[PDB]
Design a protein around this nucleic acid. Structure first.
Lengths: 171, 234, 54, 165, 137, 25, 191
RNA sequence: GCAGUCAAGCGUUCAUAGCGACAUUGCUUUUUGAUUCUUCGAUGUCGGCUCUUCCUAUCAUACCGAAGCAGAAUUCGGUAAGCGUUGGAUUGUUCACCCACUAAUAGGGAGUGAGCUGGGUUUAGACCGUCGUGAGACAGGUUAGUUUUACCCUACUGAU
RNA sequence: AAGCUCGUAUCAGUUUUAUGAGGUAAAGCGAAAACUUUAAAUAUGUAAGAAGUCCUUGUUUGAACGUGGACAUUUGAAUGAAGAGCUUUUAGUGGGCCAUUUUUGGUAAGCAGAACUGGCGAUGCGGGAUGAACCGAACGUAGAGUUAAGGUGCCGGAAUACACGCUCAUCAGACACCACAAAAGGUGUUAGUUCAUCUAGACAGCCGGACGGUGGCCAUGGAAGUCGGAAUCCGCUAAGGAGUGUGUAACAACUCACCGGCCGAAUGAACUA
């Protein structure tokens, strides 16, 4: 959708003789709190044997970019369960906010691995601070000095059906 | 480039690339040369036969001579002024031009310049220089040597290497009776010319080595003075 | 990473050695028990004494 | 092979330098209905009085076959589908030989098929074994053994059987 | 197939003295047209049969000169087997061989013939399709 | 190919020197 | 991977003027003039200063940059062809029947007649292209010379002159006739 | 086909639990091109005139590629369906077989069960063969034996 | 259908709570998987108050076979509802396909047997261009509105919408799949993952060396690294095989594998999608 980054906490059901449990926490990317919390239960289940029937969710909050203007070079880990045995993957996204970078990442995954939301697991989204930590080409292309490139054969878009000009591409 | 990539041909043979082995070996070797030998010589043996190399490297015993890749030699001897195994070694490592070239001994400071001012050996032309030879393969049915000596003492050339005289050397040849025959007299070179790659390789094919060859000398280094002498004789 | 994975493979070989020695010793118990369970301890001490040179 | 080349029993003289539970290897073969392996032969220009059947699987007929009169014969095992030998291998010796079929003992899925000598897969036939030349303790010499077939003689023409040492 | 002690139970052994007994009457057995054969009571052929042959079964050469040594660009052979030695005996062989080739030449010259007719170009007709009246499938 | 090829196992070992030690005492 | 842009730097010597309108190219040098229509290529030229041109392709994929490099080489071949000329020397080796080659005028259209190729009676006529000169060399029997300022013209002419002389149905290990390209080089010589 | 060896690689990581390609190893009659005068039960009926068209999986013709391809003549292969592909003999049969011409005598689909027609189901006639106490049947073999578009609608060919 | 006996505090294709069993095995800890305690649902099973609950003695303390006496409605879990019961009675009915799920056995491949649950028949309507079984779907006559499944270039009602990627096919694909030819080939393209080399100069290119002991030893007409068999040494090295190939009748000559000079920044290889 238009993603958001929640942070979820969980304190698998307390008991006497084993009270005040360990209070785990995750960062989730989702559209609505409902889906955030579902993903959180599922990630618990996969990490170790917990359940929903035997655990509870403490406080699901939502985070925001402290600087959603400064353009940052995110480097993302991903991994996923499809469609053969799993594997890891490392991609890079020059973008403005982590939730945007993950939007484009889900897009690219669905375009290339054909793989849907079930499998893709975000592991770590890190804002690179230095140049020369970026190594990928298609991101280093824009990290060069004094960039100046023209638009790609900018074709017009029409509102009416019959024109009288033989349009000219710009220029 | 996913596909349509130049496939790197693998032809099988017994040897194999070394890697950093011989290079690290060379570094340490010049280390345990610098530690002992007081007199170090620099040499530029650009175009040499390995016979000549062995018979100059064996000429004396109490010696040590290296054919080390120039950059490795420089990173050993000192790349810049300050850092170095011993002092003033940058003064020498700034003086490389060819297949350099490093002799280690503890002997006469003059017998080597005497030996070199003596040394001559015949060698190929090694192009871009004067050739005291103006080699016109005579229009008569050619022979293996190139056309300067009696014919009844010499064997006619070999058919198979006629294509490599026609294609790589451009002399007009049509085989006849199994033999190489030309039509018009051709000169492969006159004297004085900055000889061309073929104006050398053709001489190399005809097997005529008449070019003076000498190994030069430029500089010096002492493990007593800790600096470099340089009397320029080539 | 390579040194740490070496140390953890050495952990795996450690559990290997402990399980192999415990299993083989408890299996030697298994064997002598499953032999002597029926027949006489005299015959089992006498087989002890007929193998005693190995 | 080249990189391996780069890296770097005990027969006697009169022999070397020369080169070559009680479970049966094959229970549970599939069952052949009585409509396969039994074809019908209607008799009369008006095809009305059939009573004749024809075996369709490769059979073994014995040594005194000598076809019975046409009026009285009711089962026909046609001459094209007959066998007098079987290509049988050995578990050991790593060998295989063509052995004449002496007689057939056990045909799963019928006793009548056994009386008839039909060589469908799984059947255990009693075959000559003279060439494999076995002698036991005392061991006079064996010239007849048991062997189970392991290929339908219909998906091909051969009979392939294996011996039970 | 239910498990059994047969099937791994040997079946049809036979004895030294039985082979000795019945290998013995093959060079005896009294067969005339006034006695026909009815039954067999099968006996082991591969052992009871096989009288002697004194003919030297043809030698084999395959495992000793393969093919590429025999002929081909490899040709790992230059000198003959058995590399005839006696020149007089060899010219005896070769002259008698040409003369005996002439003897066979005259055998064919006498008996025939068809070469003169095939030089005339004509040929004998199709033997009629009636002359296949007994040889039909 | 990750840039932070240093901090990762360091953090895992910072965890492990505690996950091991909070058994005994 | 859609490089953001890639460039190829044509080098121009002195006595030669390259004029590039929309995409037509016209080179003028001591030899004369050459012209090529590069409308089919999608590049962008730009003059740097009087001794350097840049052919750039923006947002180029894979086949696009593949094409860019050939554009540079085509223009540079035109430059060498208007400054130094091209010259292909061919030979015609005959086994028994002499091959005769001659320059004729059919209506006045500059043909080459190849007669008595292996004793044929057919007269093989190959049309000399336009703007290409042909001379049967002296001091070297058998040798003919096709020179010009254009490279594709001269090369394609020689190719046709050779393809007209194939040996059909004969074993080519035995019948060694034909007209073969002895050599390809420049008019001058020095380089 | 059967019995194995491999072992590429795969398999809670598993080669030695397992699988397992391409390869491979074993006779089914023999070693000197010896003969072959050895053809083995089609359960369902087959085989033919006139005529048109289509496929290419090409026999010929066109053009090419590789062959020790000197020439000649072939062998293999590529594009290729424009064009061509026969005359007889054999019913004590033929799912075939022969000789002769020819550039070649290719292989199939939609046929022609009411265009015609003969081997074959051959209901009433009849004769022998086999089985049966029998009427009879059929393991067979032998013979003679009247189903009649179209004048309707369309298709096709021409004609107003 | 009718009769009669309730408007059921009774029932239910349901959940819960209890106790059941199959405990697969995540326990884990044992004496060193080594047990055996045990666990989630996996899926069934019986039970949860009005006659119940008891208090008091006759009987072969027990179990009750007999009494008598107290606790009507906080009278005993959630949810739904009134169609629940029982006697007489009476018409049609009996054939049969598809799918799903649980399960047993299978082989060329299909598949065969079960059991359960839908659907179809007696059943229209929207969609899938068309249709026994596919996707939606509560059929009186009409009006307005909103949607399901499917869609929105034109046929044809509805964006030649917006946004990110990928692909060019000498008959793409629009496939229906969570099937078959399907294992592979490809110097098409994109993204990745595991590996190294690299200014003690990576790859591509030119140029140079590619050597002596040593025509290594056998075999022969010649076989000097290159018809053939047996190893593969040492030397000085920068490397150099008792030699990758073209080549000679025999060496030459060229080459490679291997080093170095020139240049001056990634490139190499193998897999996955």
């Amino acid at each position: 959708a238009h993603f958001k980054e929640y942070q979820v906490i969980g304190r698998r059901l307390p008991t006497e003789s084993v009270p005040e449990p360990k209070l785990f926490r995750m960062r989730i990317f989702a559209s609505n709190e409902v889906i955030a919390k579902s993903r959180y239960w599922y990630f618990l289940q996969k990490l170790h044997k917990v359940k929903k029937a035997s655990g509870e969710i403490v406080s699901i909050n939502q985070i925001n970019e402290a600087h959603p203007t400064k353009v940052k070079n995110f480097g993302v880990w991903v991994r996923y369960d499809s469609r053969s045995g799993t594997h890891n993957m490392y991609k890079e996204i020059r973008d403005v906010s982590r939730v945007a970078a993950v939007e484009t990442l889900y897009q690219d995954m669905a375009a290339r691995h054909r793989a849907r939301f079930r499998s893709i697991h975000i592991l770590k989204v890190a804002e690179i601070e230095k140049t020369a930590d970026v190594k990928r080409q298609y991101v280093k292309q824009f990290l060069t000095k004094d960039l100046k490139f023209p638009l790609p054969h900018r074709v017009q878009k029409s509102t009416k059906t019959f024109s009288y000009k033989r349009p000219s591409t710009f220029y | 480039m996913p596909r349509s990539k130049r496939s790197k041909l693998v032809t099988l043979a017994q040897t194999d690339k070394k890697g950093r082995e011989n290079k690290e070996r060379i570094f340490d070797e010049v280390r345990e040369a610098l530690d002992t030998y007081r007199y170090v010589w620099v040499l530029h043996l650009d175009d040499v036969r390995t016979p000549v190399l062995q018979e100059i490297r064996t000429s004396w015993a109490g010696s040590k001579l290296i054919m080390g890749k120039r950059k490795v030699l420089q990173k050993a001897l000192g790349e810049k002024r300050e850092e170095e195994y011993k002092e003033n070694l940058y003064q020498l490592s700034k003086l490389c031009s060819g297949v350099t070239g490093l002799l280690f001994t503890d002997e006469d400071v003059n017998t080597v310049k005497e030996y070199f001012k003596s040394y001559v050996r015949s060698d190929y032309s090694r192009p871009n220089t004067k050739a005291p030879l103006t080699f016109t393969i005579p229009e008569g049915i050619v022979y293996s040597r190139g056309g300067q000596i009696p014919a009844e003492e010499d064997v006619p050339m070999i058919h198979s290497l006629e294509p490599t005289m026609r294609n790589k050397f451009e002399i007009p040849t049509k085989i006849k009776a199994g033999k190489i025959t030309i039509d018009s007299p051709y000169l492969v070179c006159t004297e004085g010319e900055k000889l061309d790659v073929r104006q050398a390789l053709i001489l190399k094919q005809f097997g005529i080595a008449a070019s003076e060859f000498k190994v030069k000398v430029s500089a010096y280094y002492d493990n007593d003075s800790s600096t470099v002498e340089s009397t320029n004789i080539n | 990473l390579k040194a740490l994975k070496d140390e953890k493979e050495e952990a795996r070989q450690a559990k290997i050695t402990m399980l192999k020695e415990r299993r083989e010793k408890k299996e030697e118990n298994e064997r002598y028990e499953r032999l002597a369970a029926k027949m006489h301890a005299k015959k089992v001490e006498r087989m002890r004494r007929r193998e005693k040179r190995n | 092979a080249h990189e391996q080349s780069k890296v770097k029993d005990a027969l006697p003289t009169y022999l070397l330098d020369r080169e070559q539970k009680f479970s049966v290897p094959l229970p549970k073969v599939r069952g052949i209905s009585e409509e396969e392996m039994f074809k019908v032969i209607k008799t009369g220009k008006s095809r009305s009085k059939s009573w004749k059947r024809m075996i369709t699987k490769h059979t073994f007929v014995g040594e005194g076959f000598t076809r019975r009169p046409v009026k009285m014969e009711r089962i026909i095992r046609p001459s094209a589908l007959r066998q007098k030998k079987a290509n049988v291998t050995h578990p050991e010796l790593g060998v295989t030989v063509f052995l004449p079929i002496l007689a057939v003992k056990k045909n799963p899925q019928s006793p009548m098929y056994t009386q008839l000598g039909v060589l469908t897969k799984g059947t255990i036939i009693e075959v000559n074994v003279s060439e494999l030349g076995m002698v036991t303790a005392g061991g006079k010499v064996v010239w007849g053994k048991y062997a189970q077939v392991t290929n339908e003689p219909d998906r091909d023409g051969c009979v392939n059987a294996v011996l039970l040492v | 197939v239910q498990p059994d002690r047969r099937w791994f139970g040997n079946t049809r052994v036979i004895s030294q003295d039985a082979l000795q007994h019945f290998r013995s009457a093959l060079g005896e057995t009294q067969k005339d047209t006034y006695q026909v054969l009815l039954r067999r009571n099968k006996l082991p052929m591969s052992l009871l049969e096989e009288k002697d042959a004194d003919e030297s079964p043809k030698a084999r050469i395959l495992d000793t000169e393969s093919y590429a040594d025999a002929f081909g660009p490899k040709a790992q052979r230059k000198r003959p087997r058995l590399a005839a030695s006696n020149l007089e005996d060899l010219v005896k062989a070769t002259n008698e061989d040409i003369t005996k080739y002439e003897e066979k030449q005259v055998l064919d010259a006498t008996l025939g013939g068809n070469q003169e007719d095939k030089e005339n170009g004509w040929t004998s007709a199709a033997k009629e399709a009636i002359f296949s009246k007994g040889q039909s499938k | 190919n990750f840039p932070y090829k240093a901090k990762i196992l360091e953090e895992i070992e910072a965890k492990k020197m505690k996950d091991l030690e909070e058994r005994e005492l | 991977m859609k490089y953001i842009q890639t460039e190829q730097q044509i080098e121009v010597p002195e006595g030669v003027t390259v004029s590039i309108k929309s995409r037509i190219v016209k080179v003028v040098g001591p030899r004369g003039t050459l012209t090529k229509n590069l409308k089919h290529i999608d590049v962008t030229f730009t003059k740097v200063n009087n001794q350097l041109i840049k052919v750039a392709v923006h947002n180029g994929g894979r086949k696009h940059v593949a094409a860019l490099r050939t554009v540079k080489s085509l223009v540079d071949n035109m430059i060498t062809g208007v400054t130094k000329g091209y010259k292909y020397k061919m030979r015609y080796v005959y086994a028994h029947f002499p091959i005769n080659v001659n320059i004729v005028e059919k209506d006045g259209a500059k043909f080459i007649e190849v007669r008595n190729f292996l004793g044929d009676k057919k007269i093989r006529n190959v049309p000399v292209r336009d703007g290409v000169t042909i001379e049967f060399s002296t001091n070297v029997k058998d040798e003919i010379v096709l020179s010009g300022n254009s490279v594709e013209d001269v090369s394609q002419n020689a190719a046709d002159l050779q393809q007209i002389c194939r040996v059909r149905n004969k074993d080519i290990r035995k019948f060694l006739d034909g007209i073969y390209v002895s050599h390809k080089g420049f008019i001058t010589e020095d380089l």
